Design a protein around this ligand. Structure first.
Ligand SMILES: [Mg+2]
Ligand SMILES: [Mg+2]
Ligand SMILES: [Mg+2]
Ligand SMILES: [Mg+2]
Ligand SMILES: [Mg+2]
Ligand SMILES: [Mg+2]
Ligand SMILES: [Mg+2]
Ligand SMILES: [Mg+2]
Ligand SMILES: [Mg+2]
Ligand SMILES: [Mg+2]
Ligand SMILES: [Mg+2]
Ligand SMILES: [Mg+2]
Ligand SMILES: [Mg+2]
Ligand SMILES: [Mg+2]
Ligand SMILES: [Mg+2]
Ligand SMILES: [Mg+2]
Ligand SMILES: [Mg+2]
Ligand SMILES: [Mg+2]
Ligand SMILES: [Mg+2]
Ligand SMILES: [Mg+2]
Ligand SMILES: [Mg+2]
Ligand SMILES: [Mg+2]
Ligand SMILES: [Mg+2]
Ligand SMILES: [Mg+2]
Ligand SMILES: [Mg+2]
Ligand SMILES: [Mg+2]
Ligand SMILES: [Mg+2]
Ligand SMILES: [Mg+2]
Ligand SMILES: [Mg+2]
Ligand SMILES: [Mg+2]
Ligand SMILES: [Mg+2]
Ligand SMILES: [Mg+2]
Ligand SMILES: [Mg+2]
Ligand SMILES: [Mg+2]
Ligand SMILES: [Mg+2]
Ligand SMILES: [Mg+2]
Ligand SMILES: [Mg+2]
Ligand SMILES: [Mg+2]
Ligand SMILES: [Mg+2]
Ligand SMILES: [Mg+2]
Ligand SMILES: [Mg+2]
Ligand SMILES: [Mg+2]
Ligand SMILES: [Mg+2]
Ligand SMILES: [Mg+2]
Ligand SMILES: [Mg+2]
Ligand SMILES: [Mg+2]
Lengths: 100, 54, 113, 22, 146, 56, 122
RNA sequence: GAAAAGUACCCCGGGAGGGGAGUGAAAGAGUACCUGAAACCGUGUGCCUACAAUCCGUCAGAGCCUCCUUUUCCUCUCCGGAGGAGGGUGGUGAUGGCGUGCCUUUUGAAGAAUGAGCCUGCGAGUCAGGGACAUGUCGCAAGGUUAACCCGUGUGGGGUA
RNA sequence: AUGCCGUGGUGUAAAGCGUGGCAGUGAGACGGCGGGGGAUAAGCUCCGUACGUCGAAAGGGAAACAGCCCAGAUCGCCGGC
RNA sequence: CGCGGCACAUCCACCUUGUGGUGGGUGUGGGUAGGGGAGCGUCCCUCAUUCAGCGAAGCCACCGGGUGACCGGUGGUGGA
């Protein structure tokens, strides 16, 4: 069985025992989270329905807070003398799936 | 005419690698009991003793 | 890996490209089969290269106590030496530069069955 | 003549709405 | 991460398309789609998926009379004034398969993959092909009602 | 202290003709872009000292 | 206080030449050429970090079209019908399903077809 | 190099140069000598490349090679890891999309307008003055302040013009 | 018809006005609408226009394509309209 | 539009309740000439403190870090 779970504005296809990198969640390490789902496949069924799916919630565990890859930015235009350097590191949260 | 641009490393090296020495082939000769190797065109001279093996 | 000996010839008054042309003739060969190749090569740089190869073989046989019939030219290359600069007068008060290049020739022979 | 005519007549497309520079 | 086909995942098959009364454009689109493999959900633009296509009866393709008379084929040899010129009529008389395959090849992407994709196409004027050992399934053209 | 292009030794005349050589225009051999030439806005002997009021 | 420039000046040069590894020709050996190539490269990466979001949607839509037409429905009407049925799965996961679980994709197509209106031209 | 202790002796070589010994803490200090960058030139090696139209990169991406690790196995296992399956570094990049160098100067330059072969070093708003204007800040305040000069080893104390 | 001046209500943060410090600019281009010169020619030329864009604006469309249509890039996302 | 990070200005409440910070809303954040604000790196001097022949500077490689100029750790080479 596997489910399509929504978090951070994006959706992930997960199964029990999977690790996922989602957007940062305001939760420490080791405690439990509950997330809404958009589709549950238990074999042949899909459950395909908001009324039923509003009762199903995947249960997760926070494994820690990692960072994304470092993004180097250097904006440049042809003959102006214009440059603008900028860096970025995205904050994430690693999730272990234990529910469905 | 003058070169408009300097050639890249790859283009210089392609033409430069084709400048090479041709290797001549050597055959065995036994003169005065000793064995040597000379180019095949010098066999007569080697047998008559006109070749100086240094 | 294998027992080996080294010889060098530094500040040899031969252009590095002209030395490499004849070094490519003997790279990888046995010492006996390279000495005669260099003997019969018509190029001028074949003299100094042969001298260095012979010296390396002598070092292997004497200093290392190896067998001459087992020696093979493992690595050989020609690096650049210092370059002297001269002047050739040309037409209409022009003065062009002439480069006298030298080479460093390095040979490593090794004994292997 | 052809170059100018055909350049000027390509403003009559849906994406340009009847106008182009020059 | 979205799925990307690996070397050895692609599975080919053999199709035979009969050109008895199909018009040239319809047949060319169908053949190009089969060759590229766009009908496979495992499609990837940088991978040569898709199948082998055998086209038979290339002389029966439906070409309009005015097209036979007036559609013209141009080749330049590279020499001054070296623009040579045939009609679809003359081509259909002489090398009918070339018309079909030229129409098909015009519809493929213009890159290095299409050079390898076009290697899977076989066009024959007669009703019989030599690839009987391979067992090509017949393929009729469908349109999905919307 | 340093030397300006006016105080560096020599360098009075124009090194060569303005046009027809294919070289840059130079004007003097002691111009600051030359090796061995003058210094632009270089240090000069100064008097660092302030008039702080007696009350302060 | 006379200051030699070398110690401070090489800091940016080392970073440029270190980021320019793998370029062929002068663009990995010479600092002035590597600097221009780095300008171009970082602009390209900025542009592509925003273009790939549409690129992947393009790919997913292509694969969904293939799977839908295999199950005898256009991508067009499949999307209309899924929205009508109130299914909120996104295209990334629809394409993932089409690759992995074709039976589930067929079930989804049945749901979309059922929810689609009886006459689609009214 | 602290000191010449500047490589006796042997070997290849006409020599030059080198190898072995030896001095030295160090020859990764050998009179071409402190450190020893870059351009530039080799040699070896991993991947790619001889049907393809490339501002030379970027995003997607298979496959190889390398080194670490979770599995089922050589359980020889104290072994160590051969291999298998997964994962991760690092190198390479078959293939797909996108993509008109930098500077100056211009209404407008990828421009077939200017400048630049490359690397290294150097190369351009500074200083003077109880100057002028305006501001930030500190001292004193209906007052504020000294100039020359005098006395002090000084950066301190006097000095009302 | 529009535009312009005044006035009373309502709305709108980054409007306006006075006074100082520091400027740059004073070669514009095309497109829409109204005109002069020109042959009611010009990618022509000279004016008007609380008109636009470029200049100094990247992204999408127009095959390519400063000035046309859509739309103004704070960074990230393998989300959606 | 969604979810996350940053910054400017302003409104609403506290801590010195604008020297400046703390919490939440709201608006804003393309840019040439040009104006304003805040910073990085190099060298020299003074004061305090701390490393260095058990190895400083400089240079090289690798692994990391910051919104930027840039920084750190480890190893190698080196010798004040
Ligand atoms: Mg400009
Ligand atoms: Mg003369
Ligand atoms: Mg003078
Ligand atoms: Mg003069
Ligand atoms: Mg001098
Ligand atoms: Mg001087
Ligand atoms: Mg006094
Ligand atoms: Mg590469
Ligand atoms: Mg988008
Ligand atoms: Mg000793
Ligand atoms: Mg030492
Ligand atoms: Mg030393
Ligand atoms: Mg030297
Ligand atoms: Mg040295
Ligand atoms: Mg090939
Ligand atoms: Mg082309
Ligand atoms: Mg490419
Ligand atoms: Mg293109
Ligand atoms: Mg002009
Ligand atoms: Mg040019
Ligand atoms: Mg050009
Ligand atoms: Mg021009
Ligand atoms: Mg010119
Ligand atoms: Mg000019
Ligand atoms: Mg030039
Ligand atoms: Mg000053
Ligand atoms: Mg004051
Ligand atoms: Mg003002
Ligand atoms: Mg004027
Ligand atoms: Mg004017
Ligand atoms: Mg008009
Ligand atoms: Mg007129
Ligand atoms: Mg005009
Ligand atoms: Mg004009
Ligand atoms: Mg106008
Ligand atoms: Mg301008
Ligand atoms: Mg634009
Ligand atoms: Mg504007
Ligand atoms: Mg555009
Ligand atoms: Mg904006
Ligand atoms: Mg801005
Ligand atoms: Mg500016
Ligand atoms: Mg010691
Ligand atoms: Mg120092
Ligand atoms: Mg260190
Ligand atoms: Mg060190």
């Amino acid at each position: 069985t596997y489910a399509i779970v929504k978090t951070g504005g994006k959706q992930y296809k997960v199964a029990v025992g999977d690790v996922v990198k989602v957007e940062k969640l305001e939760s420490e390490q080791g405690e439990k989270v509950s997330l809404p789902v958009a589709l549950v496949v238990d074999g042949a069924t899909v459950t395909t329905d908001a009324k039923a799916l509003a009762k199903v919630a995947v249960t997760g565990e926070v494994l820690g807070h990692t960072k994304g890859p470092k993004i180097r930015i250097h904006k440049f235009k042809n003959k102006t003398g214009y440059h603008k350097r900028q860096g970025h590191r995205q904050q994430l949260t690693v999730l272990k799936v234990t529910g469905i | 005419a003058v070169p408009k641009r300097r050639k890249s490393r790859s283009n210089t090296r392609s033409r430069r690698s084709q400048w090479k020495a041709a290797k001549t082939e050597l055959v065995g000769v036994t003169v005065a009991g000793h064995a040597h190797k000379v180019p095949r065109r010098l066999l007569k001279a080697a047998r008559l003793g006109l070749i100086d093996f240094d | 890996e294998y027992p080996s000996a080294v010889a060098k010839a530094r500040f040899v008054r031969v252009s590095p490209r002209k030395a490499r042309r004849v070094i490519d003739l003997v790279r990888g060969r046995s010492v006996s089969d390279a000495l005669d190749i260099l003997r019969w090569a018509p190029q001028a740089a074949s003299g100094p290269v042969a001298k260095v190869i012979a010296s390396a073989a002598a070092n292997a046989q004497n200093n290392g106590g190896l067998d001459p019939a087992t020696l093979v030219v493992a690595t050989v290359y020609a690096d650049q030496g210092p370059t002297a600069k001269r002047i050739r007068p040309r037409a209409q008060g022009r003065a062009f530069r002439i480069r006298r290049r030298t080479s460093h020739i390095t040979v490593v022979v090794e004994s292997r069955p | 003549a052809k170059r100018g005519r055909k350049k000027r007549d390509r403003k009559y497309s849906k994406a340009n709405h009847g106008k182009r520079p020059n | 991460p979205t799925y990307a086909p690996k070397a050895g995942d692609t599975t080919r098959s053999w199709y035979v398309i009969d050109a008895t009364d199909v018009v040239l454009g319809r047949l060319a689109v169908a053949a190009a789609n089969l060759l590229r493999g766009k009908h496979k959900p495992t499609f990837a633009p940088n991978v040569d998926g898709g199948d082998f296509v055998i086209v038979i009866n290339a002389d029966k393709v439906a070409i309009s009379g005015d097209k036979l008379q007036h559609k013209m084929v141009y080749r330049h040899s590279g020499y001054p004034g070296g623009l040579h010129k045939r009609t679809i009529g003359e081509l259909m008389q002489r090398h009918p398969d070339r018309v079909v395959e030229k129409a098909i090849l015009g519809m493929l992407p213009k890159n290095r993959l299409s050079r390898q994709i076009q290697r899977k196409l076989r066009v024959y004027a007669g009703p019989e092909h030599p690839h009987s050992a391979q067992q090509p399934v017949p393929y009729e053209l469908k349109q999905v009602a919307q | 202290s340093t030397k300006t292009r006016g105080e560096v030794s020599g360098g009075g005349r124009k090194p060569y003709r303005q046009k027809g050589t294919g070289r840059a225009r130079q004007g003097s051999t002691r111009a600051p872009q030359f090796t061995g030439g003058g210094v632009v806005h270089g240090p000069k002997p100064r008097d660092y000292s302030q008039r702080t009021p007696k009350k302060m | 206080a006379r200051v030699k420039r070398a110690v401070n000046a090489h800091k940016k040069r080392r970073s440029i030449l270190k980021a320019s590894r793998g370029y062929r020709g002068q663009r990995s050996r010479l600092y002035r050429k590597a600097k221009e190539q780095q300008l171009h490269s970082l602009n390209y990466a900025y542009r592509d970090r925003r273009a790939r979001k549409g690129e992947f949607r393009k790919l997913w839509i292509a694969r969904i079209n293939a799977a839908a037409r295999l199950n005898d429905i256009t991508y067009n009407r499949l999307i209309q019908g899924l929205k009508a049925a109130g299914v909120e799965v996104d295209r990334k996961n629809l394409a993932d399903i089409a690759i992995s679980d074709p039976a589930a994709f067929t079930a989804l197509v049945d749901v979309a077809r059922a929810a689609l209106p009886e006459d689609v031209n009214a």
